[PDB]
Design a protein around this ligand. Structure first.
Ligand SMILES: CC(=O)N[C@@H]1[C@@H](O)[C@H](O[C@@H]2O[C@H](CO[C@]3(C(=O)O)C[C@H](O)[C@@H](NC(C)=O)[C@H]([C@H](O)[C@H](O)CO)O3)[C@H](O)[C@H](O)[C@H]2O)[C@@H](CO)O[C@H]1O
Ligand SMILES: CC(=O)N[C@@H]1[C@@H](O)[C@H](O[C@@H]2O[C@H](CO[C@]3(C(=O)O)C[C@H](O)[C@@H](NC(C)=O)[C@H]([C@H](O)[C@H](O)CO)O3)[C@H](O)[C@H](O)[C@H]2O)[C@@H](CO)O[C@H]1O
Ligand SMILES: CC(=O)N[C@@H]1[C@@H](O)[C@H](O[C@@H]2O[C@H](CO[C@]3(C(=O)O)C[C@H](O)[C@@H](NC(C)=O)[C@H]([C@H](O)[C@H](O)CO)O3)[C@H](O)[C@H](O)[C@H]2O)[C@@H](CO)O[C@H]1O
Ligand SMILES: *[C@@H]1O[C@H](CO)[C@@H](O[C@@H]2O[C@H](CO)[C@@H](O)[C@H](O)[C@H]2NC(C)=O)[C@H](O)[C@H]1NC(C)=O
Ligand SMILES: *[C@@H]1O[C@H](CO)[C@@H](O[C@@H]2O[C@H](CO)[C@@H](O)[C@H](O)[C@H]2NC(C)=O)[C@H](O)[C@H]1NC(C)=O
Ligand SMILES: *[C@@H]1O[C@H](CO)[C@@H](O[C@@H]2O[C@H](CO)[C@@H](O)[C@H](O)[C@H]2NC(C)=O)[C@H](O)[C@H]1NC(C)=O
Ligand SMILES: *[C@@H]1O[C@H](CO)[C@@H](O)[C@H](O)[C@H]1NC(C)=O
Ligand SMILES: *[C@@H]1O[C@H](CO)[C@@H](O)[C@H](O)[C@H]1NC(C)=O
Ligand SMILES: *[C@@H]1O[C@H](CO)[C@@H](O)[C@H](O)[C@H]1NC(C)=O
Ligand SMILES: *[C@@H]1O[C@H](CO)[C@@H](O)[C@H](O)[C@H]1NC(C)=O
Ligand SMILES: *[C@@H]1O[C@H](CO)[C@@H](O)[C@H](O)[C@H]1NC(C)=O
Ligand SMILES: *[C@@H]1O[C@H](CO)[C@@H](O)[C@H](O)[C@H]1NC(C)=O
Ligand SMILES: *[C@@H]1O[C@H](CO)[C@@H](O)[C@H](O)[C@H]1NC(C)=O
Ligand SMILES: *[C@@H]1O[C@H](CO)[C@@H](O)[C@H](O)[C@H]1NC(C)=O
Ligand SMILES: *[C@@H]1O[C@H](CO)[C@@H](O)[C@H](O)[C@H]1NC(C)=O
Lengths: 316, 170, 170, 316, 170, 316
C-alpha cells in the first residue's frame, strides 16, 4: 500500500552549539580544540642542541659550562632553567635582544679577532671560572696593567669584518669591589672605554663598589655587544677596566629556540613547542599554552568546540 | 532545520537504518522492508567531509619567542606584549566560536535539505499514481510488490505502466 | 528571502495580525475571520531569541592600561601601542559588520522558511480536497464552516470525510 | 470557499543591513553597539582608592599629599589630573612601568629597611615638602655630610628581603643647583652610587647644574627602583648625593587602576571604565572609547549596527 | 546547492541562453523556442552585485610606519613589531579565506533558490492543467500555441480557460 | 506538448572555493586580492617633499644637503636610501622616535632661540660640512673656549616656548678624537652638560677617544632632543663639549611619511604606499607588501581568492 522516507538516528548523540541554539543533539561530531599534550620535546629529524647548564649568551663568551657549545650548529635550540650565562658574576646589556638573535641564528661559528697587546697583562683569571684551577671566559681576555697600581696606557684597537655576514662583537666592563681595588689592577684616574661603529656610538665608564657575594665574589662584569656589518670597522679606546674579545661570532643560518623542562625525544616529531612539551595536532585551535611557539594551532580560551559531522539526532 | 523535514514533517529518525544516512522503508502485499539511498547519503557525507579537510589543517606560519619564562623581560615591554597576546587570544576565541556555530547551522540545514531533495525526487517519480500522506509517506493505490519498490529506489519506476490503474483507484 | 514566500508568492503582510507572527485568514459561508499559528510563531521567536542570548554577552577578559592620558609615554613605544590598538580596532569593526550582516541574512531567510513550512503543512493536510491558488491561498471545494476551519488550524482536519465531495466538485 | 496564509507587518519597521543589501526593512531590530555612557566611576562593592592630589608613585616615597596613602588597600585605584608624585622637584626613572605594577598591586604594605648610619647627617629637609614647616619625603631620608664641605665617607649598606614576595626598593639621587652646592652638602670629588641585585647591575653618578625653578626650586631628585626577589640581597655603595630608603613596599594582591576626571558613585556597578566614566552594557561592542579598560565590549568605529529580531517588513 | 534544482533535478544549463540567467524553452505544435525570465534573472544579479558593493571597498583608516627599511630599529622592539604584524596577517588571511568561502556557498545556494522559485511560480500558474515531468519540465495536455506560451512567461496564463480541456485529457 | 525550465551555462567557467568544496566551477567570478603594483609614488594633488640626499633628521640641524629643507611643508614626505642626517659624523639619540614625529609633522617652521654668548667662540667649523669651504650645521653653533686650552666657563642658558604648540629642541655633544684634543677646544677637567624640562631630566658627560674615520674624520657628535611644551622653560648647564641650538622647530600640522626607491608621479593618485610604489585598488585585500602604509587593503598571504559572481556552471 505505501512507501515511507526517513533518516538515521542513534541512542547516543553528541550535543553541539549553533547560531540559534545551545546544545542541539547531532548524530556525530568532532573536536576542534587540541588538549592533548606530549610531555617531551619532539626532535625527530632536527639538529638539536640542548644547552643544559650552558646559558645561551654564555656560548658567545665561554664560561666553562659552555665549553662544548662554543661553535654549535642547530635547527632547534633548547634553554634550561639550570642554565647560566656567566662564571664570573655579571650580566649582559640588552640581554633579551641578543637571546632572540641567537635563538634563530642556526648556531655560531667563531673567528679570531686578531688583537695583540703591549705594555699590559692579558691572562687575568678567577676562582669562579673553573678549568683545572682558576681560569676565565674562553672567548675573552681580562686585560690588566703589567704590575700593581701601574698606569694602564690609553689603547686603540680595531677590527674590520672582512666576511659577508654581520659580526657579533662582545666586550666586558669590570667593576672591581672597591675604588682601591680598581686602581690596583688598572692604575688610578677616571678610566674611559668607548665604541664606534657606522650605526653605533657609546661610552662606558666603570663603577667600583660593593655588590653582594655571588659565587662568593662581590665583583661584577658588564658584558656589551654590537652587530658589525660587512666591511665595517669597530674601534676600542680604553684606559682600563676592559674585558677584551678574543673571537667574534658569525651566525650560521636559521633555527628556532625554546625554553623547556622536559626531555628530548627523537622518536617523536612536532613543530609546535612550549615549556611542557610538544603539541602534535592538525586541529585549527589549541587550549594548552598561549605562549607555544613554532607552527601551531591558534590558542583559544575554550576547552572545547565540537563541530557537527552528522545530521540532527531525532530518535524515537 | 530550514527545510522542515528532519525534526519536521518527518516525525523521527530510524535507529534500524545502519545501512546509510537516508533511506526507504516500504509496506506492501509481501510485508515490510527497509533500505538505504546511496546517492543522498553520499552528497551529505561528501559535503561534510569537505568541511573537515578545509578546517582540519594547521598553518605553515612560524612564530618565535618574544618574552622569557626563566628571566622576565623589562616590565613595560612585557605589559605591551601580554596585552597584545591577550588581544589576539580574544580575536581567535571569538573566531573559533563563530566558525563552529555557523558551520553547525549550515551542516544541520544541509542534511535537512538532502532529505527534502530525496523526498521530492520520489514524489516527482510517482506523479499522479500516489499521494502525500504528510508524515513523509507515499500511499500507493496500485500494487507495488518488492520488485516494484526496488524500481523506485533505482530511479527506474515507469509511472505510465501503472497510471490507468492508480488513477481509477483514487 | 531564499524560500520565496515572504516578499515572494505571498504579496504582503497583515497589519491586523497582532496575535502572532504567522496565521490564517479564512473565507466561507459564514464570513471572513483571522487567527494566529502558535507553533510556527514560536519556532521563529525561539530561534531568534536564541541568537540574541548568544550575542548579547560580554567577555570576562580583563584588559589594563598600557599607556597614559596624563603623562605621555615614550614616543616609540607609544606609536607601537597606537598602531597595535588601531590594528585591533580594524579587526573588530570588520567582525561586527560581518557578524550582523550574515546574522540578518539568516534571520530573514529563517523567517521566510518558517512561513513556507507552515504553508506546506496545510497543503499536505488537505490533500486532493483543495488547490493551490498561488497567492498563498487554498481554494476549498467542499463547505468549510467555522468549525471546519478550526480543525485545520488545530491539525485535526480529516480529509477522508470530505474527499468524495471535493473530488466531485473539481 | 477558501483559506489564506499570511504573516504580520507593521507601518513602522526598522532598516538593517545584510550580506546582500543595505537598508532592508524588518519588523523589529536591536542595537549591538553601546553608546550610552555613565559619567561617574561606578564603584559599588569595590574597595576604592581615589588618589586625588596624591600621585601613584608618591605613595612609595611619601610627599605630604600622599601621607594618607602610604599603605593603602584596593580593588580599584583612581589617578587624577591634579595628582603629583613629588614635593621636592624630580622624577622617576622607568616611571610608567612602576605605575603599571602599582595599578594592579592591590595596594601596598610598608616595612622598615633597617638602615642605620654613622659619620653623617640623616634629617635633610626643604620648603617644597610642607608638614608644619619644612619636611621631606616620609619614606625616605636625605643623607648628608655632618658639616659643610665635609668628606662623605664611602658607605656600604645591605638589605635582605626575608619575605615571601618581591620587595619594591626605591632610592633617590640629588642633583644640586651647582658644582659648589654639591660639595657643600657631600664634600668635593666625583661621587659614585651603585646598585647590585641578582638580576640587576647599575651605577649612578650625579650631575649638578641649573634647572628651571619648579616650586621655586632649581634642584632635582632622580628616583630609581628595583624589585628585590625573596631571600635576595641588595647593596648600596655611595660617596654622596644619595636619598636613602627608610622603608620597602610589598604588594598586597590584585587590583585595577584607571585615570579619570569624574566622580565616584557607590550606587552604580560596572567593570568597564574610561576617563569619562563607566560603560554598563551587555552589548558585544561599544563606540565610546577605544582605551576603555576592565572587562569591556569590543571597541568598534561604527556608531551603530542593528541586528534583525524579526522577519522582513512587507506592508500594504 | 541547497534547493536541488541547479545541478539537481535539472540536468544541466543551456549555453544557448545568452539572453539572461534563467529562462524558458518550450515545445508545441509550432516547433521549439526559447526565452529569458527577466524577474528571476534580476533578483539574482541584484543580490550578487549587492554583495560586491559591500565587499569592494577600502577603509578610510590610516596606518603609519613603526619600523624602518633603511635603518633597522632596535632588535627587541623590532621583534615585538614583527610578531605583532605577523599575528595580524594570520587574522586577516583567515578572515579573507572564510569570507570568500561562506560568500560563495550562499551565492551558489541563492542562485539555486531563484531557479526553484521560478519553477514553483509556473507550477502554481498551471494548476491541474499540467504535470511535473521531473527533469524541470511541464507536460501540457491542452494545445499551447506560441501565443499560449507567451502568456505563461508574462504571468497572464488563465488556467480556467483550458481547465476542462486538460482535465479531460489526463 | 510541453514547457521546460533551465538556466545559463558556459564552456569556460571559473573555479572557486566554498565551505564545503575546493574548486567548484561557477559561471563568473572576481578577484579579492590585489597583486597589481604601480612602480611610482602617486602624488597627484599632494604637497610632496622628496628628501633625496637630505636625511629627515638633518632637516632639524641643517647639514648642507638639507639647506633647501630647513622649513619644508608637506602632506607627503619621502625618504631615500641615499639620504644622510649628518655632515660631521655622528648620530641621534632616540633617532627613530624623532623620525616618526617628523614623518607626520606636516613639515617644520623654524624660530631663533635667542642665545647669546660671552667669553667663548661661536663659529666652529669643519671640512666635512661643505659650503664654499668649511662650514657647520646651519641650525647649530659649535661652542668653544676663546683660545687653546682655555677654561670653558660654566654656562647657564634658558629658552621659554612662548608659542601655543610644543617646541622641538636639539643639541649636540662633541666627542673629540682624544683626551688631549678635548682639552684644547674646551679646557681640561670633567665637562658636564645637563638638561631640565618639566617632564625631562638628563645629564651628558663627554667621552673622547678614537673612532673609525668616517668622511675621513674620527670625531663624533651625539645629537639629542626634547619636546618643550607651551610656556615651559628649558635650561642648559655646560662646562664644554656642547653644540648649541640656534633655532627651534615647530610642527606645522599633519602629513604621512614613506620610504621608497621609485619616482614620484603627479599623474597618478593613491593613498596606499610601500617602497616599490603605490597600490591603487578597491579590493579589500592585497598580497604585495605587508608593511604598506597609508589607507590600504588588508595584507593577506594568499595570492588569490576568487569570489563567485554567478551560479554554478553545469554544462552539457
Ligand atoms: C694570591 C693573592 O695575591 N692573594 C690571595 C687573596 O686574593 C685571597 O683572598 C681571596 O680572594 C679571592 C678573589 O681572588 C681572585 C678570584 O677572582 O678568585 C683571584 C684572581 O687572580 C684575581 N684576578 C685578577 C685578574 O685580579 C681576582 C680579582 O682580583 C677580583 O675578582 C676582582 O674583584 O680575585 C676571593 O675573594 C676569596 O673569597 C678570598 O678569600 C687569600 C685567601 O685565599 O689568599 C691570598 O694569597
Ligand atoms: C638657613 C640658611 O642657612 N640659609 C637661608 C637660605 O637658604 C635662604 O635662601 C632660600 O633658600 C631656599 C632653599 O632652602 C632649602 C630648601 O629646600 O627650602 C633649605 C633646606 O634646608 C636645604 N636642605 C638641605 C638638605 O640642604 C635645601 C637644599 O640646600 C637645596 O634645596 C639643594 O638644592 O634648601 C630657596 O632656594 C629660597 O628661594 C631661597 O630664598 C635665605 C632666604 O630665606 O635665608 C638664609 O638664611
Ligand atoms: C689649520 C690648523 O690649525 N691645522 C691644520 C690641521 O688640522 C690639518 O690636519 C687635518 O685636520 C683635519 C681636521 O680639521 C678640522 C676639520 O674638521 O676639518 C678643522 C676644523 O677647523 C676643526 N674645528 C674645530 C671647531 O676645532 C676640526 C676639529 O678640530 C676636529 O674635527 C675635532 O675632532 O678639525 C682632518 O683631520 C685632516 O684629515 C687632517 O689632515 C693639516 C693638514 O691640512 O693642516 C694644519 O694646518
Ligand atoms: C605576562 O603574563 C605572564 C603569564 O602569561 C606573567 O607571568 C606569570 O606570572 C605569574 C604570577 O606573577 C606566575 O605564577 C607565572 O609563573 C608566570 N607565567 C609565565 C609563563 O611566565 C607575567 O608576569 C606577565 N608580565 C608582566 C610584565 O606582568
Ligand atoms: C596615540 O593616540 C592618542 C589618542 O588615542 C594620542 O593622544 C591624543 O593626542 C591628541 C592630539 O595630539 C590630543 O588632542 C588628545 O588629548 C590625545 N588623546 C589621548 C587619549 O591621549 C597620542 O598622541 C598618540 N601617541 C603618539 C605617540 O603620538
Ligand atoms: C622583521 O622582519 C623584516 C622583514 O619584514 C626583516 O627585514 C628583512 O630581513 C631580511 C633578512 O634579514 C632582508 O633580506 C630584508 O632586506 C629585510 N626586509 C625588510 C623589509 O626590512 C627584519 O630583519 C625583521 N626584524 C628583526 C628584528 O629581525
Ligand atoms: C554516550 O552514553 C554514555 C552513557 O553511559 C555517556 O556516559 C557518554 O558520555 C556518551 N558519549 C557520547 C555521546 O559520545
Ligand atoms: C564520528 O566522528 C569521529 C571524529 O571524532 C570519527 O573518528 C568517527 O569515524 C565517526 N564515526 C562515525 C560512525 O561516523
Ligand atoms: C667589501 O669590500 C670588498 C673590497 O675588499 C669588496 O670586494 C666587497 O664587494 C665589499 N662588500 C660589500 C657588501 O660592501
Ligand atoms: C517610526 O516612525 C516615526 C515617524 O514619525 C519616525 O520618526 C521614527 O524614526 C520611526 N522609528 C522607528 C521605526 O523605530
Ligand atoms: C523589539 O526589540 C526591542 C529591542 O530593541 C525590544 O526591547 C522589544 O521588546 C521588541 N518589541 C517587540 C514588539 O517585539
Ligand atoms: C628563603 O630562605 C629561607 C631560609 O632562611 C627558607 O626557609 C625559604 O624556603 C627560602 N625561600 C625561597 C623562596 O627561596
Ligand atoms: C578559459 O579557457 C582557456 C582555454 O585556452 C584557458 O586557457 C583559460 O585559463 C580560461 N580562462 C577563464 C575560465 O577565465
Ligand atoms: C564577470 O566578472 C568580471 C569581474 O572579474 C566583470 O568585469 C565582468 O563584467 C563579468 N562578465 C560577465 C559576462 O558577467
Ligand atoms: C601661557 O602663558 C600666557 C601668559 O603669558 C597665557 O596667556 C596663556 O594662556 C598660557 N597658555 C597655556 C597653554 O598655558
Amino acid at each position: 500500500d505505501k512507501i515511507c522516507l526517513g533518516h538515521h538516528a542513534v541512542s547516543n548523540g553528541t550535543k553541539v552549539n549553533t547560531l540559534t541554539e545551545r546544545g542541539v543533539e547531532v548524530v556525530n561530531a568532532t573536536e576542534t580544540v587540541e588538549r592533548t599534550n606530549i610531555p617531551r620535546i619532539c626532535s625527530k629529524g632536527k639538529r638539536t642542541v640542548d644547552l643544559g647548564q650552558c646559558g645561551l649568551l654564555g656560548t658567545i663568551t665561554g664560561p666553562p659550562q659552555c665549553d662544548q657549545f662554543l661553535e654549535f650548529s642547530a635547527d632547534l635550540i633548547i634553554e634550561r632553567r639550570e642554565g647560566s650565562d656567566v662564571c664570573y658574576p655579571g650580566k649582559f646589556v640588552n640581554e633579551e635582544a641578543l637571546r632572540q638573535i641567537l635563538r634563530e641564528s642556526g648556531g655560531i661559528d667563531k673567528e679570531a679577532m686578531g688583537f695583540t697587546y703591549s705594555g699590559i697583562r692579558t691572562n687575568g683569571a678567577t676562582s669562579a671560572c673553573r678549568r683545572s684551577g682558576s681560569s676565565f671566559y674562553a672567548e675573552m681576555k681580562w686585560l690588566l696593567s703589567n704590575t700593581d697600581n701601574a698606569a694602564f696606557p690609553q689603547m686603540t684597537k680595531s677590527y674590520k669584518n672582512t666576511r659577508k655576514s654581520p659580526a657579533l662583537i662582545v666586550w666586558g666592563i669590570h667593576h672591581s669591589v672597591s675604588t682601591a681595588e680598581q686602581t690596583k689592577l688598572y692604575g688610578s684616574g677616571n678610566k674611559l672605554v668607548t665604541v664606534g661603529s657606522s650605526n653605533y656610538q657609546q661610552s662606558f665608564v666603570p663603577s667600583p663598589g660593593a655588590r653582594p657575594q655571588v659565587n662568593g665574589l662581590s665583583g661584577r662584569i658588564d658584558f656589551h655587544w654590537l652587530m658589525l656589518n660587512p666591511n665595517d670597522t669597530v674601534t676600542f679606546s680604553f684606559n682600563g677596566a676592559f674585558i677584551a674579545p678574543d673571537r667574534a661570532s658569525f651566525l650560521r643560518g636559521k633555527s628556532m629556540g625554546i625554553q623547556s623542562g622536559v626531555q628530548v625525544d627523537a622518536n617523536c616529531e612536532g613543530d609546535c613547542y612550549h615549556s611542557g612539551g610538544t603539541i602534535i595536532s592538525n586541529l585549527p585551535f589549541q587550549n594548552i599554552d598561549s605562549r607555544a611557539v613554532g607552527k601551531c594551532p591558534r590558542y583559544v580560551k575554550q576547552r572545547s568546540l565540537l563541530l557537527a559531522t552528522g545530521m540532527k539526532n531525532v530518535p524515537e | 532545520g530550514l527545510f522542515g523535514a528532519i525534526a519536521g514533517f518527518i516525525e523521527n529518525g530510524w535507529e534500524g537504518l545502519i545501512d546509510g544516512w537516508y533511506g526507504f522503508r516500504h509496506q506492501n502485499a509481501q510485508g515490510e522492508g527497509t533500505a538505504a539511498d546511496y546517492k543522498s547519503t553520499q552528497s551529505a557525507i561528501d559535503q561534510i567531509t569537505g568541511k573537515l579537510n578545509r578546517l582540519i589543517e594547521k598553518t605553515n606560519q612560524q612564530f618565535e619567542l618574544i618574552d622569557n619564562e626563566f628571566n622576565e623581560v623589562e616590565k613595560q615591554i612585557g605589559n605591551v606584549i601580554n596585552w597584545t597576546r591577550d588581544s589576539i587570544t580574544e580575536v581567535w576565541s571569538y573566531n573559533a566560536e563563530l566558525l563552529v556555530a555557523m558551520e553547525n547551522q549550515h551542516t544541520i540545514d544541509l542534511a535537512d535539505s538532502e532529505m527534502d531533495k530525496l523526498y521530492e525526487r520520489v514524489k516527482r517519480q510517482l506523479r499522479e499514481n500516489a499521494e502525500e500522506d504528510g508524515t513523509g509517506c507515499f500511499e500507493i493505490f496500485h500494487k507495488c510488490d518488492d520488485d516494484c519498490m526496488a524500481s523506485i529506489r533505482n530511479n527506474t519506476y515507469d509511472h505510465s505502466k501503472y497510471r490507468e490503474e492508480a488513477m481509477q483507484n483514487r
